[PDB]
């Protein structure tokens, strides 16, 4: 079995990553955080966790629920970049695929900034730092997608994904962008899934195929619903948004693409057991995060499998979102729903 060879180049990484895994905030620790009175207490409490002294450079009067999000995220990004720097070959190739998604977000976020005439010096403070590439600010220059493709996006690794973007009208608004935004993901996920199928060893292969499958389903259910915002979005446009790799495909994705009402979507999901209950009751966004963490928790049980990088990343992403939710409740001095974080560990 491949665990025999895996450690040749990744044994060091697998150790460090699981080092981070052992640092994740536990169910009990969130409760100890929940009891704080102020952000100044939340900082002091956090110092007892594996987050350590990260905020020690921030004055008491400077703490805000915004700044805590920035610093907590910054720690994650440095740890991610450190892990990437120590990698090579297919593993380095694998990690670079992860950042593609974030920079696809950044490109969309950057272009709408020009549609609304906001300054690059401001927009570049909201971009996601893992989605950074050299030419990113140059997106500010033009409006039509053809110019942006010809002058910038031809060069970035995103270039292959634009197969279906140029069908746009000659003039651009934000609504076109979110359609373009999704079209890029469809190509990106399908390419990423294909790359996993070819170049990643088992069991990590089957693990990642599961994780990416969930993401494809999550996007599908979101898009099938939110697309009803417009007076209409054509079914052959919807079919260009829904990715092909998910559990829903093709049996359910067709109905979702064809659906023109909520009850149509609900009927479509009624058949798939994994999601049979999601729309019938309870908060939808929590259910997705709930399943997402349970999948990551299960993924950690495997060994000598590079998928741990993805499981660690998504887990700590949710950890930040847990922290900010608690901090926001603390700062705004409202607590009746402070408990609603999601903690599988």
């Amino acid at each position, epitope marked *: 079995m491949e665990g025999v060879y895996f450690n040749i180049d990744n044994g060091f990484i697998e150790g460090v990553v699981r080092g981070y895994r052992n640092g994740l905030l536990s169910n009990n620790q969130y409760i100890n955080l929940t009891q704080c009175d102020t952000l100044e207490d939340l900082k002091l409490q956090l110092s007892s966790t594996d987050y350590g002294n990260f905020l020690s450079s921030v004055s008491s009067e400077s703490l805000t629920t915004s700044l805590i999000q920035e610093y907590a995220s910054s720690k994650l990004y440095h740890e991610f970049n450190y892990i990437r720097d120590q990698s090579s070959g297919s593993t380095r190739k694998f990690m670079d695929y992860i950042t593609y998604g974030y920079m696809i977000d950044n490109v969309a976020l950057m272009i709408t900034g020009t549609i609304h005439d906001r300054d690059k010096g401001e927009i570049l403070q909201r971009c996601h730092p893992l989605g950074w590439f050299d030419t990113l600010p140059t997106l500010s220059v033009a409006t039509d997608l053809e110019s942006l493709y010809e002058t910038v996006l031809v060069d970035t690794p995103l270039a292959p994904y634009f197969k279906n973007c140029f069908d746009t009208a000659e003039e651009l608004d*934000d*609504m076109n962008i*979110e359609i373009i935004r*999704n079209k890029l993901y469809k190509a990106y996920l399908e390419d990423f899934y294909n790359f996993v199928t070819e170049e990643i060893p088992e069991p990590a292969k089957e693990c990642m195929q599961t994780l990416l499958g969930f993401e494809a389903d*999550r*996007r599908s*259910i*979101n*898009i099938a*619903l*939110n*697309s*009803l*915002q417009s*007076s209409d979005i054509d079914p052959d446009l919807k079919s260009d948004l829904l990715p092909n790799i998910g559990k829903l495909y093709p049996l359910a994705t067709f109905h979702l693409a064809q659906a023109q*009402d*909520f*009850e149509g979507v609900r009927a479509a999901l009624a058949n798939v057991y994994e999601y049979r209950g999601f*729309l019938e*009751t309870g*908060n*939808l*966004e929590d259910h*997705f995060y709930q399943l997402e963490m349970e999948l990551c928790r299960d993924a950690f049980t495997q060994q000598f499998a590079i998928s741990t990088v993805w499981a660690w990343m998504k887990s700590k992403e949710q950890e930040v979102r847990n922290i900010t939710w608690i901090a926001e409740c603390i700062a705004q001095n409202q607590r009746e729903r402070i408990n609603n974080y999601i903690s599988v560990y």
Partner: nanobody
Amino acid sequence: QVQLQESGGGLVQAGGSLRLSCAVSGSIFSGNAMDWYRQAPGKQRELVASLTSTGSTNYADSVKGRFTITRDNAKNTVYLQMNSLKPEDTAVYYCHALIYRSRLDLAPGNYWGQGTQVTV
């Protein structure tokens, strides 16, 4: 953060009209699509009528032709009614709301009521 709950219903004699209401909070009709679902003693639950964001109104009129829709955005609540009730109509009626949270195609806001019983 949205709380839905409905009112009215209960037992009423056949052939009479009946009126149901469903409150909504922390949100506005802008980007709102909203429905009623029946659930008979037979376990399955089903759509009967709807308010779309654009003001169109879906119905199960093949079997609920005398159920009706009302738009209440000026008061940010719900008052939907039916005429000439029949004994087969005895069901828990749930109001449902789908919120187009934002442009970003994250998971949308989705909300259900607690269900109002109806008896004939």
